[PDB]
Design a protein around this ligand. Structure first.
Ligand code: HEM
Ligand SMILES: [Mg+2]
Ligand SMILES: [Mg+2]
Ligand SMILES: [Mg+2]
Length: 306
């Protein structure tokens, strides 16, 4: 019965991440926009189907939820949890609404962002806006393939969609965003083999390092999580490169979706606070988080019915 938003998108070479705060008294304008956001997605995207692949996933933050709605809330919806590691910090930054806009073309993303922001004029203040672009063969700004071990099909739906554990919000998901900037000069001072040690995969061929070679403080080791029952705890990432050459800004826009924030926050805790065998994730020695926000992306029928 409950239809998910397009959390599980086919691959898209362009994206706009829009994060805004809701102004005092902007709630009615926001509720009106939420009830139309699927209609606007069809209005912009339909004429470019099937290759356009335009979608918007709309998220609401914990504080914004309690300003917009009354009664029961999604069981896991809280402000992003700031992590204060001995070396690396995951900052919490303002954000009430997320529009995760993806397509095969930036123009479609741009036109939908314009229609959305057009309707929210006078009710919201811009916080963050990133225009993301596919970078060669699905690489990120560190020169590694990014997305390889994402779950797909049924395994992806089981990892990202709320079900019987929170029935009133079935078909929703939890999105965590962090905008990362990379120290490309420091990164380029490492050999390819030193970089592979940091990530935990081979750079050109994208083959995972063997169990006896993969460092405990590699990115892949610390973001590989097995639950008590033995099965892998997974998230769905759609990381997007961005930047500005004049400002020497070379970034990764991280977005991770999970059926509970506990899986994503377990990964972040291992990365920023480490484990018995790792001080922290070596990727953070080349990567600074400058935002951090958590959102609930409800079933599409929750937004339509407002
Ligand atoms: C800081 C910028 C980031 C970059 C540049 C980055 C890059 C990558 C790369 C290159 C891989 C290996 C290929 C793949 O399977 O996708 C990877 C894997 C992964 N990343 Fe990250 N990542 C970043 C942040 C994060 C964060 C913040 C999390 C979680 C909160 C995360 C979770 C994962 C997971 C779950 C995998 C799959 C590991 C596995 O099961 O094999 N990443 N990432
Ligand atoms: Mg990609
Ligand atoms: Mg530099
Ligand atoms: Mg694995």
């Amino acid at each position: 019965e409950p239809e998910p938003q397009m959390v599980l998108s086919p691959l898209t070479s362009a994206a706009i991440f829009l994060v805004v705060t809701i102004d005092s008294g902007g709630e009615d304008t926001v509720r009106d926009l939420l009830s139309d956001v699927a209609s606007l997605e069809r209005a912009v995207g339909f004429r470019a189907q099937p290759d356009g692949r335009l979608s918007c996933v709309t998220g609401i933050g914990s504080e914004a939820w309690d300003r917009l709605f009354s009664g029961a809330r999604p069981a896991g919806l809280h402000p992003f949890r700031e992590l204060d590691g001995p070396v690396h910090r995951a900052v919490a930054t303002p954000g009430d609404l997320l529009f995760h806009i993806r397509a095969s073309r930036l123009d479609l993303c741009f036109a939908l962002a314009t229609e959305i922001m057009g309707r929210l004029r006078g009710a919201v203040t811009p916080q963050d806006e990133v225009h993301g672009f596919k970078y060669f063969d699905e690489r990120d700004m560190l020169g590694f393939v990014d997305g390889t071990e994402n779950p797909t099909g049924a395994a992806a739906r089981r990892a990202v969609l709320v079900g019987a554990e929170d029935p009133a919000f079935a078909g929703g998901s939890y999105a965590v965003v962090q905008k990362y900037l990379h120290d490309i000069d420091a990164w380029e001072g490492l050999s390819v083999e030193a970089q592979e040690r940091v990530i935990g995969r081979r750079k050109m061929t994208d083959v995972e390092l063997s169990d006896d070679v993969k460092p405990a403080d590699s990115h892949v080791a610390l973001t590989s999580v097995t639950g008590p029952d033995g099965s892998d705890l997974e998230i769905l990432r759609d990381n997007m490169p961005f930047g500005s050459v004049g400002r020497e800004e070379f970034g990764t826009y991280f977005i991770g979706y999970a059926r509970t924030p506990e899986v994503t926050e377990t990964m972040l805790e291992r990365m920023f606070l480490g484990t018995a065998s790792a001080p922290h994730d070596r990727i953070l020695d080349f990567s600074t988080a400058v935002t951090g926000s958590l959102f609930f992306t409800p079933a599409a029928d929750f937004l339509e019915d407002l």
